[PDB]
Design a binder for this molecule. Structure first.
Ligand SMILES: O=C(Cc1ccc(Cl)c(Cl)c1)Nc1cncc2cnccc12
Ligand SMILES: O=C(Cc1ccc(Cl)c(Cl)c1)Nc1cncc2cnccc12
Ligand SMILES: [Cl-]
Lengths: 305, 301
């Protein structure tokens, strides 16, 4: 028993982290096969960021301008190209530690592990969710750009996020590994703000099921609700709409605990209208939304990688 | 910016996890150099749990009774010995992925990362703290025994915990890597209960400093307190006494934020008295105590 915010083991990703230096800027790169992926803003100066023409800045660069360091070994860049907001640096050496991998774009509500890096060296791993406003509530300092978000499926790493910037409110924005930003963000020094965030409803329900599996039942009630009545209530409390897809995904947890999804929805509705009343659920006084239904099953059943 | 519960990258530890089988029992082992460390209770049968005589049970075992598996390769056990509650299985191959490491015994309040494993395979990494009652609030299922707790400051892995058992309340007990249990626990099925747990006061203060560094100042007040008056108040909320050692440890954070330790203690007293009033601190509606002063400095600076 116990329920923790748990990240995937980061080993397969640690063996891919490298340091990328271009001019005065140093950030992280992801070395897979003979390619190093990193944010394209590494080519920018402070002035260039205000209004950058990345094609123009990149054409002026030569391969030797990019200093790639894997541990204490310098890699030689033999080519460079840009794919959306990611820079792809072709290197002469293929990473011998390249794991089985895929590039996947995730949807809001999905969780992933972040391997925070500085100077190509991993310093921490944490689990977070893609917020409905497309930001992530990460923990990043200067030099963290190029740090990646991932999930593991059996022995395959699915890279889903690359860190690019921090917004004024302290939240973070980035792209998938194809360089497409999550959210309406751009890699340019201009006024940008995260939209009003919402709670990931399906994840809160999954977490309430995790609490039931762990013996926390105080919030359960005899009531059920319709999906439409729940969505009318949930919308009032800035909660994401719960779809039939979400109800179906929660099915296995509903079968294991004996609590129907719409029955758990009525518990959630009462929690929203009345609060916790000085009580906690899984050591939290707030409803947690950064555990998906898959994360709960994985943790409460012990899937390994 | 941002403050997250952050674990160390687990790679150096993943390359050490192996599966140890003895009879019908399968658990995890830590393979460092030519030695596999695992809980000694792996040798116990059904009636060898209430009152096992581990020396007696171990003398009856041979090297070939221990089946050690590293990935899909079986390792050959060439010796076995017991050090307190840990079994040390000498193997014929030194782990090529052995990182720079040390065995460190930690004190209550200290934090560490746990690499939860099943059948010698890592499944997740999370952050823990050694509770003042010497238990850990982990997340472990059957088969997780032998999973380890560690810190990775620099390129060296400091192993501080090996998971041994789950207590009736769902909390976890284990040993350092020398086999010495944390707390008054024994590796027997005898009636054992975790003592009443308390809040790690110095860690809550470190977390309040993390919140100030991140721009959260609403809980600050114009008051200060004496160390003794703070402790008299804190103990009424089941908070650990704050010692002069703790006040000294909070010095660098105090200097960085400009808030004296006893000034932050008065904020904590006020929070205990009033609660949060619908407000949160670093995205939490409870006072967090699983970030040490060292964790806060590392994460913020
Ligand atoms: O904010 C930037 C650089 C940056 C700035 C503007 C633009 Cl338009 C872009 Cl694309 C990138 N990266 C940083 C990342 N994470 C945390 C950070 C904390 N402190 C500082 C920097 C941080
Ligand atoms: O509790 C035991 C086995 C055990 C039992 C009694 C004694 Cl005296 C000893 Cl030393 C070891 N390990 C397990 C570890 N963690 C979570 C667990 C959840 N479910 C089951 C087992 C769990
Ligand atoms: Cl310690």
């Amino acid at each position: 028993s116990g329920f923790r915010k748990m990240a995937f083991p980061s080993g397969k990703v640690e063996g891919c982290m490298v340091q990328v230096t271009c001019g005065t800027t140093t950030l992280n790169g992801l070395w897979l096969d003979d390619v190093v992926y990193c944010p394209r803003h590494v080519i920018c100066t402070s002035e260039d960021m205000l209004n950058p023409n990345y094609e123009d800045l990149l054409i002026r660069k030569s391969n030797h301008n990019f200093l790639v360091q894997a541990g204490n070994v310098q890699l030689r860049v033999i080519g460079h190209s840009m794919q959306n907001c990611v820079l792809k640096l072709k290197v002469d050496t293929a990473n011998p530690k390249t794991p089985k991998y895929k590039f996947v774009r995730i949807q809001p509500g999905q969780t992933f592990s972040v391997l925070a890096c500085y100077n190509g060296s991993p310093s921490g791993v944490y689990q977070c969710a893609m917020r409905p406003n497309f930001t992530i509530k990460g923990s990043f300092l200067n030099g963290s750009c190029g740090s990646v978000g991932f999930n593991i499926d059996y022995d395959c790493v699915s890279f889903c996020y690359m860190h690019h910037m921090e917004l004024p409110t302290g939240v973070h924005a980035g792209t998938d590994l194809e360089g497409n930003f999550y959210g309406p963000f751009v890699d340019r020094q201009t006024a940008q703000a995260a939209g009003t965030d919402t709670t990931i409803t399906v994840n809160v329900l999954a977490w309430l099921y995790a609490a039931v599996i762990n013996g926390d039942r105080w919030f359960l009630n005899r009531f059920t609700t319709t999906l439409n009545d729940f969505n009318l209530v949930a919308m009032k409390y800035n909660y994401e709409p719960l779809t039939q897809d979400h109800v179906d995904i929660l099915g296995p947890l509903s079968a294991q605990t004996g609590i129907a999804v719409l029955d758990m929805c009525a518990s959630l509705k009462e929690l929203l209208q009345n609060g916790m009343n000085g009580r906690t659920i899984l050591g939290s006084a707030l409803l947690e939304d950064e555990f998906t239904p898959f994360d709960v099953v994985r943790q409460c059943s012990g899937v390994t990688f």
